[PDB]
Amino acid sequence: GDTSQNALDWPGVYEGVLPCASCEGIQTTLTLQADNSFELKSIYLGKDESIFKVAGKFDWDSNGSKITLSDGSKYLVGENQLLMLDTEGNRITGGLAEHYILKKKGM
Amino acid sequence: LGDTSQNALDWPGVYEGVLPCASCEGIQTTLTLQADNSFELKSIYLGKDESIFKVAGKFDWDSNGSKITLSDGSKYLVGENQLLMLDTEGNRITGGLAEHYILKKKGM
Amino acid sequence: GDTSQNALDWPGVYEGVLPCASCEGIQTTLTLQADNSFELKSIYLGKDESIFKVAGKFDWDSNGSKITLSDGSKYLVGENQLLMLDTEGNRITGGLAEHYILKKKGM
Amino acid sequence: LGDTSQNALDWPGVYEGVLPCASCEGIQTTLTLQADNSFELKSIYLGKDESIFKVAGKFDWDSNGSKITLSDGSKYLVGENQLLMLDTEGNRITGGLAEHYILKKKGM
Numbered sequence: 001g002d003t004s005q006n007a008l009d010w011p012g013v014y015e016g017v018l019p020c021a022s023c024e025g026i027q028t029t030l031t032l033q034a035d036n037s038f039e040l041k042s043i044y045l046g047k048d049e050s051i052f053k054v055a056g057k058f059d060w061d062s063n064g065s066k067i068t069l070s071d072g073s074k075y076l077v078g079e080n081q082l083l084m085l086d087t088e089g090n091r092i093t094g095g096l097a098e099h100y101i102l103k104k105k106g107m
Numbered sequence: 108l109g110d111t112s113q114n115a116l117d118w119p120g121v122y123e124g125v126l127p128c129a130s131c132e133g134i135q136t137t138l139t140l141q142a143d144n145s146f147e148l149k150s151i152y153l154g155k156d157e158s159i160f161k162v163a164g165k166f167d168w169d170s171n172g173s174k175i176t177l178s179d180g181s182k183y184l185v186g187e188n189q190l191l192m193l194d195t196e197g198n199r200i201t202g203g204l205a206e207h208y209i210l211k212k213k214g215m
Numbered sequence: 216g217d218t219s220q221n222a223l224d225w226p227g228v229y230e231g232v233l234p235c236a237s238c239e240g241i242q243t244t245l246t247l248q249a250d251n252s253f254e255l256k257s258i259y260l261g262k263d264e265s266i267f268k269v270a271g272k273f274d275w276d277s278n279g280s281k282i283t284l285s286d287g288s289k290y291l292v293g294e295n296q297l298l299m300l301d302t303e304g305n306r307i308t309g310g311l312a313e314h315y316i317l318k319k320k321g322m
Numbered sequence: 323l324g325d326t327s328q329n330a331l332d333w334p335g336v337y338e339g340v341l342p343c344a345s346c347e348g349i350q351t352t353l354t355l356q357a358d359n360s361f362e363l364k365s366i367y368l369g370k371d372e373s374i375f376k377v378a379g380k381f382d383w384d385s386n387g388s389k390i391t392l393s394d395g396s397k398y399l400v401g402e403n404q405l406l407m408l409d410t411e412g413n414r415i416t417g418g419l420a421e422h423y424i425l426k427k428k429g430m
Contacts, residue, residue, distance in 0.1 A: 017203075019127040019128065019129060019204060020127065020129065021126070021127065021129045021134075022181065022182075022192060022193075022194055022195060023195070023200060024194070024200050024201050024202035024204075024205075025202055025203070025204070026129070045202065046194045046195075046196055046198060046200075047196060047198055047271070047285075048196055048269055048270065048271030048272075048285040048286075049269075049270075050195075050267065050268070050269035050285075050286060051267070051268050051269070052265065052266070052267045053265070053266050053268075054263055054264075054265035054266070055263065055264075056262070056263030057263075062385065070262075070263040070265075070410070070411045071263075071265060071410050071411075072391075072395055072397070072410040072411070072412075073130070084130065085130070086130050086131050086154055086155065086156050087130060087131075087156065087391060087393060087394070087395045088155075088156045088380075088382050088391065088393070090154065090155040090156055091155070092128075092130065092131060092132055092154060093132045093153075093154055093155060094132035094133055094153065094154070095133075096127065096132070096133065096204075097132075100130075152379075152393070156379070156380060156393055157379070157393075158377060158378065158379030158380070158393035158394065159377070159378050159379065160375060160376070160377050160394075161375070161376045161377075162373060162374070162375050162376075163373065163374050164367075164371070164372070164373030164374065165303075165371060165373070167303050170277065176287075176302060176303065178302060178303070178367070178371055178372075178373035179302070179373065179375075180287055180302045182287070195285070195286050195287040196271070196285045196286075196287070197287075232418075233344070234342040234343065234344060234419060235342065235344065236341070236342065236343065236344045236349075237396065237397075237407060237408075237409055237410060237415070238409045238410070238415060239409070239415050239416050239417035239419075239420075240417055240418070240419070241344070260417065261409045261410075261411055261413060261415075262411060262413055263411055265410075288345070299345065301346050301369055301370065301371050302345060302346075302371065303370075303371045305369065305370040305371055306370070307343075307345065307346060307347055307369060308347045308368075308369055308370060309347035309348055309368065309369070310348075311347070311348065311419075312347075315345075
């Protein structure tokens with residue numbers, strides 16, 4: 001039971017501008033609820049703004065540490081943040097590693 | 108005849124860079140363009156879970172002879188000794204990572 | 216001047232369920248205005264529904280026949296329909312060719 | 323030990339099918355899985371503008387030993403003499419084109 005899922009005040013809204021494969025950035029808002037539902041809004045930055053929204057349920061891993069959303073995206077749940085992981089749940093390395101953090105709103 | 112980049116530039120060749128990756132460290136990219144408007148793309152998705160993509164196809168130029176669209180839908184502005192990846196609208200990508208979208212000709 | 220752009224009552228709302236690479240289908244609504252603006256809504260069908268929206272300007276080709284949206288997608292404008300084309304503006308062939316038609320709403 | 327498809331099936335092998343394509347005729351697909359959880363994918367995007375993709379990488383199984391996720395994010399349900407492509411939620415794809423998501427083992 002000594003998990004992040006139990007330890008952290010994780011329900012809430014997280015925001016960041018994530019790297020985009022073919023655009024300025026993905027202005028991301030990810031809202032998590034205590035009932036393991038979520039709302040993801042992804043704004044692909046550019047002259048037209050293009051907005052992807054998905055709402056659904058997410059799952060916790062067996063360690064109560066990482067979540068997987070219904071769009072397949074994974075996050076490490078941390079103190080005042082979510083860290084988006086690679087397709088297979090590993091931390092994203094390299095020069096842009098910090099760009100994958102979604103900070104709890106107001107921080 | 109058209110006073111265009113397509114006609115002005117020695118654009119057939121090999122271009123390389125490391126592009127931003129939506130969910131990985133980066134995309135080590137090698138894009139080879141031929142005069143007959145065929146291309147070959149290699150993309151190594153870097154990180155703890157590496158993969159390699161290789162794409163071959165044809166590309167097309169816009170009416171202005173400036174921008175190319177690859178068969179995978181990616182667009183590039185063809186420039187002097189470089190390609191600049193554009194967004195889906197065909198616009199130059201602005202912001203913090205703008206320079207990360209440049210593929211320079213090999214040996215530069 | 217003898218073009219589809221001049222001939223057709225093309226402004227309006229077009230709908231269809233397009234093939235999806237990794238889902239049931241893309242329930243698509245594409246609204247075109249006379250001023251060459253558009254609104255595209257794409258619902259990726261499944262248990263969570265995921266919705267992509269983009270609004271912007273579109274361009275006509277020199278023949279006044281095919282349009283290109285700000286997300287890069289292309290359409291042949293026809294009588295009471297739009298026909299989505301491949302990346303390079305060619306008609307999509309094969310067994311599923313008719314699945315790429317967006318019919319004007321009410322038809 | 324786990325009573326799972328991963329342990330039950332002779333799943334290493336080559337699977338083929340023609341998948342639906344978002345903006346082309348179809349995707350003639352060949353997916354090769356190895357016992358060490360590495361894969362090779364060939365995808366020919368059919369139509370008037372043909373292109374060929376080749377992807378190599380690793381894949382991972384879910385805890386139930388039933389579903390695999392490739393390094394490109396695609397998921398499949400591993401079954402008897404077939405793979406079934408799943409949606410991004412990992413659910414079986416329903417509707418009019420449901421059977422088009424099956425890749426059968428080669429020679430079937």
